[PDB]
Amino acid sequence: IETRYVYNTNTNAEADVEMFLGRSALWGKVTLTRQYAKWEINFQEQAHIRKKFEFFTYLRFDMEVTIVTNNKGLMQIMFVPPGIDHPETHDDRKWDSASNPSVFFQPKSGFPRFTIPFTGLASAYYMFYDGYDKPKGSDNNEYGIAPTNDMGLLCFRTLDNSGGNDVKIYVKPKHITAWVPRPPRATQYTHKYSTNYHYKPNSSGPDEHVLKDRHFIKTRPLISSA
Amino acid sequence: IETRYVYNTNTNAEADVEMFLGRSALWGKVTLTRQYAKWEINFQEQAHIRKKFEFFTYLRFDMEVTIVTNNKGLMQIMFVPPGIDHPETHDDRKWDSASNPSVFFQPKSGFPRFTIPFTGLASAYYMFYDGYDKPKGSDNNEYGIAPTNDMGLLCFRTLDNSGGNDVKIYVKPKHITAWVPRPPRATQYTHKYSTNYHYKPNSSGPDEHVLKDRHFIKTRPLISSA
Amino acid sequence: GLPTRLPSGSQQFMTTEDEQSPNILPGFHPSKKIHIPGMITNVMHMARVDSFIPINNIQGEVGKVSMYYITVTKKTVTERILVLPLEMSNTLFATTLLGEVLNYYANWSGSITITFMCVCDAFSTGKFLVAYTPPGGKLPEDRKQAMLGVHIIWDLGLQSSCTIVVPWISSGFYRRTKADSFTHGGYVSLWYQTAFVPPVSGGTGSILATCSACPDMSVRMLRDSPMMEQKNELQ
Amino acid sequence: GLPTRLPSGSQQFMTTEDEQSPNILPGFHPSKKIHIPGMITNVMHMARVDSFIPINNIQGEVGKVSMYYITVTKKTVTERILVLPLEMSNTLFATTLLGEVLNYYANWSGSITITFMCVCDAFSTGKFLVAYTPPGGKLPEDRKQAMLGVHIIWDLGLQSSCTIVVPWISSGFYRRTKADSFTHGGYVSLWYQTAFVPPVSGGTGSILATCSACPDMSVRMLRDSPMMEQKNELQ
Amino acid sequence: GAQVSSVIKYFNINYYKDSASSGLSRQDFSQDPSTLTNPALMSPSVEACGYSDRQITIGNSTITTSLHTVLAYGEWPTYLSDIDATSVDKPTHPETSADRFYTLDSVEWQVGSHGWWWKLPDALKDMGVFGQNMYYHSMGRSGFIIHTQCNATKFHSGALIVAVIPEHQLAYVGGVKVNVGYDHTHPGQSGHQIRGPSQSNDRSGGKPDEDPLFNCNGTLLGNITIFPHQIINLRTNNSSTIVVPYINCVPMDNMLKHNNLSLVIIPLVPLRPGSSGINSVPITVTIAPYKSEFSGAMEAQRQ
Amino acid sequence: GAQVSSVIKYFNINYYKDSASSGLSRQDFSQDPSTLTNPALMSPSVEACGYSDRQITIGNSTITTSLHTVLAYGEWPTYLSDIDATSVDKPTHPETSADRFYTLDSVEWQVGSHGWWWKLPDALKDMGVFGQNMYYHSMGRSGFIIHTQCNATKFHSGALIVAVIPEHQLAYVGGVKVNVGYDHTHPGQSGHQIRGPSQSNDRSGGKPDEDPLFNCNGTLLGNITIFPHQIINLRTNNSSTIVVPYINCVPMDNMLKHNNLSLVIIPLVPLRPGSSGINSVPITVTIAPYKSEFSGAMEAQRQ
Amino acid sequence: NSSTIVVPYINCVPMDNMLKHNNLSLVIIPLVPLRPGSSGINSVPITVTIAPYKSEFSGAMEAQRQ
Amino acid sequence: SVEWQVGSHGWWWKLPDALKDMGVFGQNMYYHSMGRSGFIIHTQCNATKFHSGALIVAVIPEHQLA
Incomplete structure (x- = not known):
């Protein structure tokens, strides 16, 4: 009913956090080898989309997930809510679930898309968390945002094998609310859920344990001559 | 809501610049050899559509791009905005972009179409530009409209190889505003971004360096006998 | 849910259709639109502008500036100086602003406007007969058969008498741009009414001619102009 | 039933489109939204915050805290202390809050704001000339050619004179973030107006510089920032 | 929706x-x-809008001729005003010192002379305090008034086409892919005498096309009438006047790099002497910057 | 629909x-x-909203300096109130006994000193009846007032950056995938002296990153100005004051496990003595819990 | 440390040549010498910055430059 | 800039003359018969609290040298 005027575009409307983060980007790639694939939902894997969320300490957003597959003939996705056991293979009895939400599609028809509202449990997502899940003396303490949530996971199977094995998960943050701004990251990520930038290039032989920053600052011959 | 009366047709409504240039024509052809293809967006390549824009010195228009492919099974297009590095191959890590807009489609479903608004940076596009980007003494001066803009480029990959390799890019100028009229071109284009008409037919051997106009004027035996 | 049907011509892609399309790059802010002199909203207004007809196009004169003018001298008996067969596909008209706007459209209507301009000295004087023979008539071959059509007497020392307006005389409502015997539009020819009298024997006149559309000119059915051809890729 | 048509761009999937989507997990109740300090609704407001420019980036100084400050001493004749070529793709600006917000966008507009801060003792005194040479000008090479552009005289013992506002002087309405000869934005250079006079001969000054956006800064056409690269998968 | x-x-x-x-x-x-x-x-008659703005005198120099002035694109030159402007910085208006008629080197018009062209503002770069303000400023915009004046007797004959082409982009003199040199398209006040066409014309350093029929850009003469123009017929008029506003997409451009106009003068019909023995006549060009604005002051861009 | x-x-x-x-x-x-x-x-000036809330005295301890106080995120600290709170259980407000200025161990600022950081509330865990209420309560929230004070003479030189980073997550000192230890990120009042960078820095037990340029988290200095901060320049001011509200997604968190702030002090420009012979100066930090709330009382979580 | 002086146009004539006639002089005299203190700096720069203000020109011609 | 030393007797500049090569002011001098201008002279010399000595910055209309 309501006619809801907005505008065409304003000056910096490119730059508002809704439009800045409101593009659907790839958060992970999996392969269907054995007809089964599994992906734990996170933005930690892809360094470009990870760097944009990390301008902000806290985010509250819905996400819509779009599955781009080169396979064919039929597929099932099962969103497994936290705290239970996901199907470990195709032909697993746990693919029959009265409750766990799942989505069937035929990849040649369209691209399946659904929405996962804000599950954060904390009232916002921690991009950076300075604290531990277990108390002081505890033997294994996870540091950072890893214990603070889990967004679920997506199990994939293929009922008709047919074409390629490559699944791509594109998700779009929508309805974003971002809070405490942070410096952009200056250095290439070397891990997931970890903020450490030291690369440690080698493994097997000599000249091990020399490790690199991998920063983006580059030099100039002379100040004042630029 | 509003009922917006126009007309059926008026007399010369065929000839107004909106209808004159408002047909979707082929601005370039590429081939998917290696599963990768790339096209820098320009109208300079196709002589017929180039001749129509060049009745006018300045144009301001949106463009909608329609991709006609004989390939199948899936494809990705990535619009790479200026000033960054485009993916150089399929399986290039730069096909994973939090920001660069891209469009997936399955060629057997439909023809993908999107719109690129006016990017001109100058308030209109230069069809002809009489000046240089670099100052006087500069060693390499690009003459003409080549430095004045870049409309981006379109990167193509194929996730499922399947059928043919031939991509065709049809774009339609829409919302056109054309300004300073010019004489129609009388001569066949011999280059891109260059207004020179001398053909230089040969290369390797003798009788080189004789060059042709290739104009469209043809004679008659006698004045007064026509 | 809602019973939609997809008829024939639904999943079609038509070059010439009109449809809305999603905007890649949303929120993009176009640079502001200033006031540039010379806006042209319609391409017929280019056809309205006078443009010189290559009235001398022959073996030697094509490709040079001399292709635009005819030489007239004093002659004892009338001659037929020039003939402009009226077609928009003909090199005479096709290469002008009029003719090369009209070669995008498959047929037309309205009046051509042909102006003559004599480049000579101030002491020369002349009377010319400019005659348009309607569709269906032969090319006159002598002045007494040219005068019986539309004609004007173009006199030097006026330059208000230069312009002949080719009237629209046709059976059908439109005339095909490509010359054919069915719709053919006729002939504009130039004659000596009296003479071109130079200030001194052996003097020489030089005549130019322009063509433009009249405000009632109309065109339809946009097509590929024969006036451009791409025989090899541009690189 | 209803004659719908599916045009081109119907079954498309566009990364940047805007479309509603079905909610898996219906009836899900989001946890309540409390008041967290520091909400940021737009990413240009990060560009507004001062951030130190790595004005000393050379072979040895890169990768250390000393990359942010320049050493000034007392000199008999004016020298060119520093040059900040104005580009948002350049390591000087690209690594700040300004430049690294603007490297997501393919071009920009508005004024840069450059503040200088001298770290020395309270007894030192100095006069500096901060000059912005507009687009199209050469880098000055001497102070008499630097003074003829935009300039401010930055005097110690005020710290109201530190900030120079790089004006927006451009032909086009927007300037490309990636440096090119067509849109290039010019040069901010630092000179000795008079001298840096220490309290004792052999004294040493140390100069820092910040950059932030002015409220009329604008950006458009979001893209992939060159400021991040993933060369191997994160595990 | x-x-x-x-x-x-x-x-x-x-x-x-x-x-x-x-x-x-x-x-x-x-x-x-x-x-x-x-x-x-x-190309209206400059009375076809209004004549109150015009005996023609700009800035301390006088022209006495003004119903036959053509007003290019029916628009009278005017300052950038506001709201169409990018920078807020106040432009400089030199007015009567840099807005005045600058008469260039006359050129013999002979039998066989193919044509001439001048690029603008370029032709004026060394002329007066207009040509000084080019170098000391980043940007600038100007409207011009071109007065072309060629006088012969009643015995002479022949016609010229005086046209002003916005953004006249020259073709390279032939063959391979080359940009015409910065120096050959910036000749100065002397302009460029069109010496071609021939197969023997020199090809080096990006020299411009010498063919007058194709307008050096590959488009016919006789369609050159779509631009603002006048035809000087020695049987009728000896002179010409054209008033061009500032045509460009940008509010202000460099003026050293970008030449936003070209003054082209083509001997449409050759010059024939009558009973007189005069084989050649001078053509003189007088350019007046009008409503010129400069902004972005700096050190002289002069090398 | x-x-x-x-x-x-x-x-x-x-x-x-x-x-x-x-x-x-x-x-x-x-x-x-x-x-x-x-x-x-x-980082507003704490007068840029209102100064009525402030000579600075919290809970029996006095600071005399307050237009130069920066109010972090322009928000004044305040109690959780209601409707933003999870539990209905009435929190405890210690007020003036546990809300007071606690001055920590001073740290020599020398030539070559790379920096220092303190985690909060952690630094206060042994301090007074604030540090008692941490252990005896499940949860808690507090705003803080950080007063950093370093005095040298007019002959000295050099600058500090005093910044407060919400959720400052340290990087492990290098190489493989390890979580920094609970003990190295909870140093107590002594904080952590940044001793790096070097290739020789010890890697064991999850020790934190020692590199001050990358903020120990991998993000440059000079972008550290996006957080609430002040720059202490010994040519200008000797001290600093920062008023932080309670920043977190949760109304109340543990305070033993989660450190929701970090006080980072970086010698942006080194300390140079003048004609004076003093090579090092103390930096002192004084933290005041402000508007602190505790709930979920239990036995002391102390080991 | 500094000085500022705002001079109008002083002359009998409304406008003079400006090449031949210098209608002002800026004189800077070290009234008391420069003595360094405990510092070792024996000399200090003096800088002059002139702004033409409310300038008018008339009688345009070819540059009087030689 | 000019070094101010021990024993430096003084300096003078003639106006408009000092500006004759400066910018588009110094261009308008040559291309015009006449002209008038007011000026703003900003003289700036900075030393420390240890230094000493004084300058006289004066503007003399029609300063005719001997």
């Missing part, structure tokens, strides 16, 4: 909610309905 | 009937139309 804020109505609807996602543009009406010529083209 | 309860209108419609199924979020208007800066960022 969205909408926006023999006769067929239609509901204006943006299905995709945006401008520029919309389809092609027609001419709307609010209520039912129930154009042929553009005077801006066709 | 559903709906819900250059200018383009649109009919607001949820095709799928739900929120969060809706598309991206724009800025609505009820009628036709016809922002540039955020003062909350940029």
Whole structure:
């Protein structure tokens, strides 16, 4: 009913956090080898989309997930809510679930898309968390945002094998609310859920344990001559 | 809501610049050899559509791009905005972009179409530009409209190889505003971004360096006998 | 849910259709639109502008500036100086602003406007007969058969008498741009009414001619102009 | 039933489109939204915050805290202390809050704001000339050619004179973030107006510089920032 | 969806909610309905709008001739004003010191002379305090008044075409892919004498096309009448005047790199002497910067 | 469907009937139309909102300096109130006994000293009856007032950056995948002296990153100004004051496990003695818990 | 440390040549010498910055430059 | 700039003359018969609290040298 005027575009409307983060980007790639694939939902894997969320300490957003597959003939996705056991293979009895939400599609028809509202449990997502899940003396303490949530996971199977094995998960943050701004990251990520930038290039032989920053600052011959 | 009366047709409504240039024509052809293809967006390549824009010195228009492919099974297009590095191959890590807009489609479903608004940076596009980007003494001066803009480029990959390799890019100028009229071109284009008409037919051997106009004027035996 | 049907011509892609399309790059802010002199909203207004007809196009004169003018001298008996067969596909008209706007459209209507301009000295004087023979008539071959059509007497020392307006005389409502015997539009020819009298024997006149559309000119059915051809890729 | 048509761009999937989507997990109740300090609704407001420019980036100084400050001493004749070529793709600006917000966008507009801060003792005194040479000008090479552009005289013992506002002087309405000869934005250079006079001969000054956006800064056409690269998968 | 804020109505609807996602543009009406010529083209008579702005005198120099002035694109030159301008910085207006008639080197018009062209503002770069303000400023815009004057007797004959081409982009003299050199398209006040066409014309350093028929850009003469022009016929008039506003997409451009106009003078019909023995006549060009603005002051861009 | 309860209108419609199924979020208007800066960022002056709340005295301890106080995120600390709170259980307010200035061990600032950091509330865990209420309560929230004070003479030189980083997550000192130890990120009042960078820095037991340029988290200095900060320049001011509210997603967190702030002090420009012979100066930090709340009382979580 | 002086146009004539006639002089005299203190700096720069203000020109010609 | 030393007797500049090569002011001198201008002279010399000595910055109309 309501006619809801907005505008065409304003000056910096490119730059508002809704439009800045409101593009659907790839958060992970999996392969269907054995007809089964599994992906734990996170933005930690892809360094470009990870760097944009990390301008902000806290985010509250819905996400819509779009599955781009080169396979064919039929597929099932099962969103497994936290705290239970996901199907470990195709032909697993746990693919029959009265409750766990799942989505069937035929990849040649369209691209399946659904929405996962804000599950954060904390009232916002921690991009950076300075604290531990277990108390002081505890033997294994996870540091950072890893214990603070889990967004679920997506199990994939293929009922008709047919074409390629490559699944791509594109998700779009929508309805974003971002809070405490942070410096952009200056250095290439070397891990997931970890903020450490030291690369440690080698493994097997000599000249091990020399490790690199991998920063983006580059030099100039002379100040004042630029 | 509003009922917006126009007309059926008026007399010369065929000839107004909106209808004159408002047909979707082929601005370039590429081939998917290696599963990768790339096209820098320009109208300079196709002589017929180039001749129509060049009745006018300045144009301001949106463009909608329609991709006609004989390939199948899936494809990705990535619009790479200026000033960054485009993916150089399929399986290039730069096909994973939090920001660069891209469009997936399955060629057997439909023809993908999107719109690129006016990017001109100058308030209109230069069809002809009489000046240089670099100052006087500069060693390499690009003459003409080549430095004045870049409309981006379109990167193509194929996730499922399947059928043919031939991509065709049809774009339609829409919302056109054309300004300073010019004489129609009388001569066949011999280059891109260059207004020179001398053909230089040969290369390797003798009788080189004789060059042709290739104009469209043809004679008659006698004045007064026509 | 809602019973939609997809008829024939639904999943079609038509070059010439009109449809809305999603905007890649949303929120993009176009640079502001200033006031540039010379806006042209319609391409017929280019056809309205006078443009010189290559009235001398022959073996030697094509490709040079001399292709635009005819030489007239004093002659004892009338001659037929020039003939402009009226077609928009003909090199005479096709290469002008009029003719090369009209070669995008498959047929037309309205009046051509042909102006003559004599480049000579101030002491020369002349009377010319400019005659348009309607569709269906032969090319006159002598002045007494040219005068019986539309004609004007173009006199030097006026330059208000230069312009002949080719009237629209046709059976059908439109005339095909490509010359054919069915719709053919006729002939504009130039004659000596009296003479071109130079200030001194052996003097020489030089005549130019322009063509433009009249405000009632109309065109339809946009097509590929024969006036451009791409025989090899541009690189 | 209803004659719908599916045009081109119907079954498309566009990364940047805007479309509603079905909610898996219906009836899900989001946890309540409390008041967290520091909400940021737009990413240009990060560009507004001062951030130190790595004005000393050379072979040895890169990768250390000393990359942010320049050493000034007392000199008999004016020298060119520093040059900040104005580009948002350049390591000087690209690594700040300004430049690294603007490297997501393919071009920009508005004024840069450059503040200088001298770290020395309270007894030192100095006069500096901060000059912005507009687009199209050469880098000055001497102070008499630097003074003829935009300039401010930055005097110690005020710290109201530190900030120079790089004006927006451009032909086009927007300037490309990636440096090119067509849109290039010019040069901010630092000179000795008079001298840096220490309290004792052999004294040493140390100069820092910040950059932030002015409220009329604008950006458009979001893209992939060159400021991040993933060369191997994160595990 | 969205909408926006023999006769067929239609509901204006943006299905995709945006401008520029919309389809092609027609001419709307609010209520039912129930154009042929553009005077801006066709080069009006400068009385065809108004003559109050004009005996022609700009800035301490006088022209006495002004119903036969052609007003290019029917627009009178004017300052950038505001709201069409990019920078807020106040431009400089030199007015009567740099807005004045600058007469250039005369050129013999002979038998066989193919033509001449001058690039603007370039021709004026060394002329007076206009040519000083080019170098000391980043940007600038100017309108011009071109007065072309060629006088012969009643015995002479022949015609010129005096045309002003916005953004006249020269073709390279032939063959391979080369940009014409910065120096050959910036000749100075002397302009460029068109010496071609020939197969023997030199090809080096990006030299411009020498063929007058194709306008050096590959488009015929006789269609050159679409630009602002006058035809000087020695049987009728000896002189010409053209008033061009500032044509460009940008409010202000460099003026050293970008030449936004060209003054082309083509001997459409050759020069024939009569009983007189005079084989050649001078053609003189007088350019007046008008409503010129400069901004972005710096050190002289002069090398 | 559903709906819900250059200018383009649109009919607001949820095709799928739900929120969060809706598309991206724009800025609505009820009628036709016809922002540039955020003062909350940029660290206001605590007079830039109001000074009535402030000579600075909390809870029996006095600071005499307060226009130069920076109010972090332009928000004044305040109790959790209601309606933003999870538990209905009434929190404890210690007020003036546990809300007071606690001065920590001074640290020599030398030539070559790379920096220092303190985690909060952690630094205060042994301090007074604030540090007692941490252990005896499940949860808690507090705002802090950080007063950093370093005095040298007019002969000395050099500058510090005093910044407060919400959720400052340290990087492990290098190489393989390890979580920094609970003990190394909870140093107590002594904080952590940044001794690096070097290739020789010890890697064991999850020790934190020693590199001050990358903020130990991998983000440059000089962008550290996006957080609430002050720059102490020995030419200008000797001291600093920062008022932080309680920043967190949760109304109350543990305070033993989660450190929701970090006080980082970086010698941006080194310390150079003048004619004076003093090579090092103490830096002193004084932290005041402010508007602190505790709930979920239990046995002391102390080991 | 500094000085500022705002001079109008002083002359009998409304406008003079400006090449031949210098209608002002800026004189800077070290009234008391420069003595360094405990510092070792024996000399200090003096800088002069002149702004033409409310300038008018008339009688345009070819540059009088030689 | 000019070094101010021990024993430096003084300096003078003639106006408009000092500006004759400066910018588009110094261009308008040559291309015009006449002209008038007011000036703003900003003289700036900075030393420390240890230094000493004084300058006289004066503007003399029609300063005719001997």
